[PDB]
Amino acid sequence: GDVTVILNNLLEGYDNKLRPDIGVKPTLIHTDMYVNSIGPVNAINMEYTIDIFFAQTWYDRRLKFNSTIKVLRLNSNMVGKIWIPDTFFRNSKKADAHWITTPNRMLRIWNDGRVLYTLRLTIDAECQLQLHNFPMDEHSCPLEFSSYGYPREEIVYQWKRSSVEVGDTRSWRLYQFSFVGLRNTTEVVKTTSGDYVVMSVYFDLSRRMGYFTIQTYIPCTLIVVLSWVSFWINKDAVPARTSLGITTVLTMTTLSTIARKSLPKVSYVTAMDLFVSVCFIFVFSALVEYGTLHYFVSSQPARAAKMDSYARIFFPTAFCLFNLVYWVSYLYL
Amino acid sequence: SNMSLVKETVDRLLKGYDIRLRPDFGGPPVAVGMNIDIASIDMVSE
Ligand SMILES: *[C@@H]1O[C@H](CO)[C@@H](O[C@@H]2O[C@H](CO)[C@@H](O[C@@H]3O[C@H](CO[C@H]4O[C@H](CO[C@H]5O[C@H](CO)[C@@H](O)[C@H](O)[C@@H]5O[C@H]5O[C@H](CO)[C@@H](O)[C@H](O)[C@@H]5O)[C@@H](O)[C@H](O[C@H]5O[C@H](CO)[C@@H](O)[C@H](O)[C@@H]5O)[C@@H]4O)[C@@H](O)[C@H](O[C@H]4O[C@H](CO)[C@@H](O)[C@H](O)[C@@H]4O[C@H]4O[C@H](CO)[C@@H](O)[C@H](O)[C@@H]4O[C@H]4O[C@H](CO)[C@@H](O)[C@H](O)[C@@H]4O)[C@@H]3O)[C@H](O)[C@H]2NC(C)=O)[C@H](O)[C@H]1NC(C)=O
Ligand SMILES: *[C@@H]1O[C@H](CO)[C@@H](O[C@@H]2O[C@H](CO)[C@@H](O)[C@H](O)[C@H]2NC(C)=O)[C@H](O)[C@H]1NC(C)=O
């Protein structure tokens, strides 16, 4: 009817290569979000997937009409005919919009030129996780976006009061972590092209213990007590105790290999590989202890007789102590 | 206004423009200066 006439009059003499107020003042853009789901935070690649509903609203004095209807509600068929800011996410490894069934976009042009442009995004953002205190580690890693070609003098972004609003936080794929909060931030960065207004949203993730508790901690403590079981077998049966020790060491090294294979290749010492190393040391010390016991039986029997009962008490106490120390320290750190 | 002036300038620049011909299609070569700002070296596979 008459909406066609309005849409035709708005696009007559319209240049979608020139930002609104090209030579007057910067374009103020209000940005909002809606975090559908924060995908799996895989530490191997130092990345994390997020799915959002990015909304940008600005003023365009050229899309200003005067009719009874207050707002024009449009699909993605008129997004490529007006000016649209070139917002890109500066820390996204790979991100893409949605196109099924029709491009997931929305355009609402109000009466006074106010434009609202909303789209659906799935961003594989990047954040370098400091994998210390693993798996008792907490991260707070961002999602940064800014204009690409327009510096601070042309495009200025600005958060709304209720900009970022998470969803239900229950049907998310955060397996090993747990969402605890977020915060928005605005800064200005320097590039070879100019000064840009960079907005950021920081998501706070806390690694919940569990999978690792049952994948490496329990197996290794159970291997340690298995190695302690050798201290009660009589000292005359050599092959039994040697088999115990050597097979326990083999299982210990296999479990350490797996545990380190969990997280990526990092050249520093974490808190999990420290644990498996202490357990390895324990097993190796029980085996060399039995070796010295068997060697001393030939030299002095009473020495070995006292040594066995000495170790039976010295090993579990040293392990309880180690555990206590370790756990308390890391839980306070 | 300033917007009309900019619009007319851009419409003049892009009118009568041939993409098939590099700048100075007969004379000296064009000098293209390169800048690179490395964001990240992601993964190095052996
Ligand atoms: C190296 O080579 C590469 C390969 O050649 C090359 O990649 C290609 O790049 C070009 C340009 O960047 C891409 O072409 C554009 O694609 C845009 C969207 O791309 C997404 O979708 C395509 C598949 O496209 C189908 O689906 C969309 C959504 O439904 C349709 O809109 C398309 O027309 C098309 O539909 C046909 O196919 C369907 C089957 O899939 C059928 O069901 C359907 O019936 C049609 O037959 C994907 O392939 C893309 O994936 C790739 O790109 C992403 C980008 O992130 C990558 O991540 C990914 O890995 C892939 O590489 C992606 O998912 C199109 O929107 C776009 O067309 C619009 O823009 C042009 C230019 O402005 C307009 O001229 C055109 O008219 C379109 O505008 C109309 O529609 C928009 C809708 O948003 C309106 O807003 C707009 O106003 C306008 O409407 C007006 O005109 C309409 C008629 O046109 C009219 O109907 C309206 O009423 C109104 O008047 C363009 O096609 C191409 O897809 C890439 N190909 C591949 C394989 O990646 C790469 O760039 C090269 N590298 C370099 C450095 O050069
Ligand atoms: C998101 O950004 C807005 C705008 O910067 C923040 O809103 C401000 O909040 C502080 C304290 O909460 C107030 O003193 C300001 O008056 C607010 N500004 C406006 C314009 O409303 C908001 O706190 C941010 N959300 C966070 C950090 O979670």
Kindly report the three-state secondary structure assignment for every residue of A66-96.
CCCCCEEEECCCCHHHCCCCCEEECCEEEEE
For residue A210, count other CB atoms closer than 10 A to its CB: 11
The angstrom resolution of this structure is 2.7
A283: alpha, beta or left, given left = phi > 0 and alpha = psi -120 to 50? alpha
Contact A55, A95 (CB under 8 A): no
Closest chain B residue to A90 measured between Cα atoms?
Answer: B39
Distance CA A96, CA A75 (A): 19
Both tokens assigned to A159: 């958060």
Q: Which of A293, A131, A142 is nearest to A207 (CA)?
A: A131
| β pairing state of A155-164 and A27-33 | parallel
Q: Nearest bound ligand to CA A11?
A: 1
Buried b (16+ CB within 10 A) or exposed e, A175-192: ebbebeebebeeeeeeee
The residues, ordered by sequence, that sit 6+ positions from A239 with a Cβ below 8 Å of its Cβ are none
Q: Report CB contact under 8 Å: A18, B40.
A: no
The length of chain B in residues reads: 46
Task: For residue B4, list chain A residues with Cβ-Cβ distance below 8 A.
Answer: none
Task: Say whether A186 sits in a helix, a strand or coil.
Answer: strand
The residues, ordered by sequence, that sit 6+ positions from A201 with a Cβ below 8 Å of its Cβ are A33, A142, A143, A144, A164, A182, A183, A184, A185
Measured CA to CA in angstroms, residue A211 lies from A214, A259, A270 at distances of: 5, 11, 17
The residues, ordered by sequence, that sit 6+ positions from A280 with a Cβ below 8 Å of its Cβ are A249, A252, A253, A256
Q: Ligand 1 centre from A105 Cα, in Å? A: 14
Contact A143, A125 (CB under 8 A): yes
Q: Report CB contact under 8 Å: A192, B35.
A: yes
Ligand 1 atom nearest to CA at A102: 29
Single-letter residue type at A116: L
Q: Ligand 1 centre from A282 Cα, in Å? A: 62
Task: Say whether A222 sits in a helix, a strand or coil.
Answer: helix
Distance CA B14, CA B21 (A): 14
Closest chain A residue to B37 measured between Cα atoms?
Answer: A192
Calculated CA dihedral for residues A262, A264, A269, A273, nearest 10 degrees = 10
Q: Nearest bound ligand to CA A162?
A: 2
Q: Ligand 2 centre from A161 Cα, in Å? A: 6
- Method used for this model? cryo-EM
Distance CA A230, CA A247 (A): 12
Contact A48, A41 (CB under 8 A): yes
Q: Report CB contact under 8 Å: A18, B7.
A: yes
Distance CA A53, CA A104 (A): 10
Distance CA A29, CA A159 (A): 9
The residues, ordered by sequence, that sit 6+ positions from B18 with a Cβ below 8 Å of its Cβ are none
Closest chain A residue to B35 measured between Cα atoms?
Answer: A192
